[PDB]
Structure formats: C-alpha cells, structure tokens
Design an enzyme around this catalytic site. Structure first.
Site, mmCIF file in Angstrom:
data_model
loop_
_atom_site.group_PDB
_atom_site.id
_atom_site.type_symbol
_atom_site.label_atom_id
_atom_site.label_comp_id
_atom_site.label_asym_id
_atom_site.label_seq_id
_atom_site.Cartn_x
_atom_site.Cartn_y
_atom_site.Cartn_z
ATOM 1 C CD1 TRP B 17 -2.129 -2.017 1.381
ATOM 2 C CD2 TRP B 17 -3.359 -0.231 0.796
ATOM 3 N NE1 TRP B 17 -3.428 -2.435 1.195
ATOM 4 C CE2 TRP B 17 -4.196 -1.356 0.820
ATOM 5 C CE3 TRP B 17 -3.907 1.012 0.453
ATOM 6 C CZ2 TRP B 17 -5.555 -1.275 0.528
ATOM 7 C CZ3 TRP B 17 -5.257 1.089 0.153
ATOM 8 C CH2 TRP B 17 -6.065 -0.047 0.187
ATOM 9 C CG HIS B 51 -3.008 -9.322 4.211
ATOM 10 N ND1 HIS B 51 -2.857 -8.874 2.915
ATOM 11 C CD2 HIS B 51 -3.834 -8.444 4.818
ATOM 12 C CE1 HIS B 51 -3.552 -7.764 2.755
ATOM 13 N NE2 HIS B 51 -4.155 -7.486 3.894
ATOM 14 C CG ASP B 53 -7.800 -6.732 6.466
ATOM 15 O OD1 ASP B 53 -6.590 -6.842 6.194
ATOM 16 O OD2 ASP B 53 -8.621 -6.134 5.746
ATOM 17 C CG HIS B 57 -6.646 -2.746 9.052
ATOM 18 N ND1 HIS B 57 -5.521 -1.959 8.984
ATOM 19 C CD2 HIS B 57 -7.215 -2.699 7.823
ATOM 20 C CE1 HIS B 57 -5.413 -1.443 7.771
ATOM 21 N NE2 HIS B 57 -6.434 -1.868 7.053
ATOM 22 C CG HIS B 158 -12.201 -3.265 5.501
ATOM 23 N ND1 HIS B 158 -12.013 -2.588 4.314
ATOM 24 C CD2 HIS B 158 -11.137 -4.087 5.636
ATOM 25 C CE1 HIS B 158 -10.891 -2.997 3.753
ATOM 26 N NE2 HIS B 158 -10.340 -3.900 4.539
ATOM 27 C CD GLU B 170 -8.026 -6.973 2.498
ATOM 28 O OE1 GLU B 170 -6.982 -6.813 3.137
ATOM 29 O OE2 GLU B 170 -8.978 -6.164 2.545
HETATM 30 ZN ZN LIG Z 1 -5.541 -5.830 4.576
HETATM 31 ZN ZN LIG Z 2 -8.435 -4.923 4.137
#
Ligand SMILES: [Zn+2]
Ligand SMILES: [Zn+2]
Ligand SMILES: [Mg+2]
Ligand SMILES: [Mg+2]
Ligand SMILES: [Zn+2]
Ligand SMILES: [Zn+2]
Lengths: 206, 206
Positions: B17, B51, B53, B57, B158, B170
């Site tokens: 990101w 990964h 979440d 997060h 989310h 994801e």
């Molecule tokens: Zn993520």
């Molecule tokens: Zn995410």
C-alpha cells in the site's frame, strides 16, 4: 473436532536467540492520526516462536522457503512423549510404534516458557534421521527452539534430517495436548528468499 | 489430491500500500559470520501479500489477530468468478449456488500482479454483508488488496463485513484455479497485538 493451537504467542515479550532481532509489533500510525486505519509494522527474526527451518538456514546452497513442498506441512501427524531425556536418537524412538507415520511431533516438556530462551535443551542425535526416513517420516517437530544443542556450530541434526528429506518444525507448544494421532497444519509463508518462516501450527484429533 | 498454493510470493519486489512499510527480508547473520547458520530478519506491513485483516485494523476497539477464531480460517470453501464487474454486491451474488457455504473466495481477475499496486480494483458493496451472513458465510476472500475502494477512507465494506461476523482475506491468487469446492487453509500467525497477519493460503479440491 476443533483445531487446537500449538503455536507460541508472538508479542514483544517473546524470547529470541541471543543477540538476534528482537520481536517488534508496533502501531506506526494510529486510526486517530491517519483518519481511517491502524497502520502496523512487524519486525522479527525468522526463528522466533513456532517456525520452520529451510535448508538455506544451515547450507548456503540449500532450498529457500518457497522451494519447500507444501504437502509436507499439512496432514496426519503422531505426537509422542520424550520427556526427561538428555537427547533423542534411534535408541529412544525404537520403543514407539511408528509404522505409517508421515509427521512426528516430540514433546520434551523441557522448556515451555516462550518468553525465555533456554540455557540447555534436549537435542536430536544424527542417527535419528536414517531411522525416521526409513519409516517414511517427512517432518519432525520439537517443543524447543532447536533440534541441535544450543551452542553447537556443526548442526549435525539439521544437516542429517534434511539429507534424509525430513523437514524441521521448532517451538511447538504441546503440554496442553495428549499423545496420539492428529491432523497437523504448519505452513510456511511464501517467502521466496528466506531461511525459514514463522508458522501457525495447529492440530485436530483424528 | 494435492494442496494448491494460492498465496503471493513474499520478497523485496512485492508491492505494498501507499504509505505502508516496504517489505524487507534480509540475511542478518550469514553462515560465514555466525559460523553455522544464515539467520533472516523480516520487516513488513502485515497487509503485504496474501493476508487476513483483524478488526483492529479499522476499529480501535476491534479484535487483534490472536483473538480471532482459528476455526474460521480452515475448512470447506467455495470459489466463484466475479470478473469484469466494477463492484460486487447482493445483486451479483444472487445468481450463485451458495447454500450451506461457510467460506467464499471471489475471483475478480482484475489485477493479479503481486509486484505492482493497482490503481483501481473492484470493491464489495455494503449490501453484500447481510446477504452473505444470512447464508452462514463466515469468511470472504478476494484476489485484490482490499474489499473497499483503494481511495476510500470510510471502509464501509470492512466495517459491514465485521458487523455481520464475516472475516476478511485479501490478495489470494486464483487465476490458476477453477471454480468449485475446496478445503481452504489460511491461518493467521499467533500475533497478540496485530491488526492482521500474512498467511499461507492453500486449497485442496474436494
Ligand atoms: Zn488488509
Ligand atoms: Zn483490508
Ligand atoms: Mg475517518
Ligand atoms: Mg553442498
Ligand atoms: Zn529455526
Ligand atoms: Zn533450527
């Protein structure tokens, strides 16, 4: 039947090899700061908590993590008690009925304190490797940080195990589980270049 | 049947990101230096590669990784194609057979380049969450870095997914696997305090 966690909790209090990268999880930038998310950073040695070794860890020409066969790290496993032994080799494993076993976890119950690094552990002797390999065993797991003595520079067990196609899982947590047969999952992360990987090791009774 | 890897390779070339920690694997101690082993040091954002979440997060009061129920991340999963759609919601999922499904992976085939971060992705619309939850779905996985638009700071998907007890996976890699039923493994590391975890996601056909 439910999956049972046999992994060491990963946090800033966990032990590491002497001098090795201390474990660090930190929130770099909070949801209050960012306006949306908590942004974290993970810093760790590969050999922290429950993890697997790749041959590259002890052999410059050895396979890296992503080269390792994932089938090895999922499937039937047997768990046995080898507590109160200074070292474990062929002699100690002959008393167990291990025919048809593909994965073997050894409960030494020697340490079991994830937040301290031990001063001494029971190691595996080199003659364990041809013995286990002959039976078809592809993975050995121990509830201590190493299959070799902590001060050993030759790492005979690491070398002999991988010479016989036996993969290595270290720092499993087994004091809360009974001996017997389970399904194991202990998958390495898809690390192209690494010498090993932390894993989430879990088991389910057969 | 063999397990099939659906994880992105983790190495220094992988994308992250905007604003995240760049991925770093380095050999801290070479075998030449240590006299026995190559020891690796891993530094990463947890939202790198394949990964999961944790609610923490996107919600300060949300569960951390170790608090998450491991049963969610192992078991039967259905994989479906939702390519060539700008966004996916109830309307798009109504046409699928999803009765009794517990875990659902969505192939958007929109990106699939692990070493580049996309400029746009298909997102999930908030009305997907009550729909999926009503069917009993506990985990949703996508082959892109997010369930929300990349520039979105509210993260409605989310929040709504979690609001309906749906967990989030994801960056799975699905371009090499056919639609249908599989067993999934995608376990988080035992991270006490983290906002998510890299995983090794694999599947085996029923
Ligand atoms: Zn993520
Ligand atoms: Zn995410
Ligand atoms: Mg905000
Ligand atoms: Mg050689
Ligand atoms: Zn190790
Ligand atoms: Zn080792």
């Amino acid at each position: 039947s439910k999956w049972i966690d046999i992994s060491q909790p990963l946090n800033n209090d966990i032990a590491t090899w002497p001098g090795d990268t201390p474990f660090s999880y930190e929130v770099l930038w909070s949801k209050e700061e960012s306006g949306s998310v908590n942004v974290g950073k993970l810093t760790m040695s590969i050999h922290t908590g429950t993890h697997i070794d790749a041959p590259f860890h002890f052999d410059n020409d050895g396979k890296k993590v992503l080269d390792l066969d994932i089938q090895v790290y999922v499937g039937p496993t047997r768990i046995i008690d080898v507590s109160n032994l200074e070292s474990i080799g062929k002699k100690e494993l002959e008393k167990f009925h291990l025919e048809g076993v593909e994965r073997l976890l050894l409960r030494t119950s020697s340490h079991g304190k994830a937040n301290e690094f031990p001063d001494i552990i029971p190691h595996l002797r080199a003659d364990i490797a041809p013995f286990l390999s002959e039976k078809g065993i592809r993975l050995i797991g121990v509830d201590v940080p190493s299959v070799d003595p902590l001060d050993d520079k030759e790492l005979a067990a690491h070398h002999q195990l991988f010479k016989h196609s036996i993969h290595i899982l270290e720092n499993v947590v087994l004091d809360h589980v009974a001996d017997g047969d389970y399904e194991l999952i202990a998958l390495p992360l898809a690390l192209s270049d690494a010498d090993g990987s932390p894993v989430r090791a879990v088991i389910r009774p057969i």
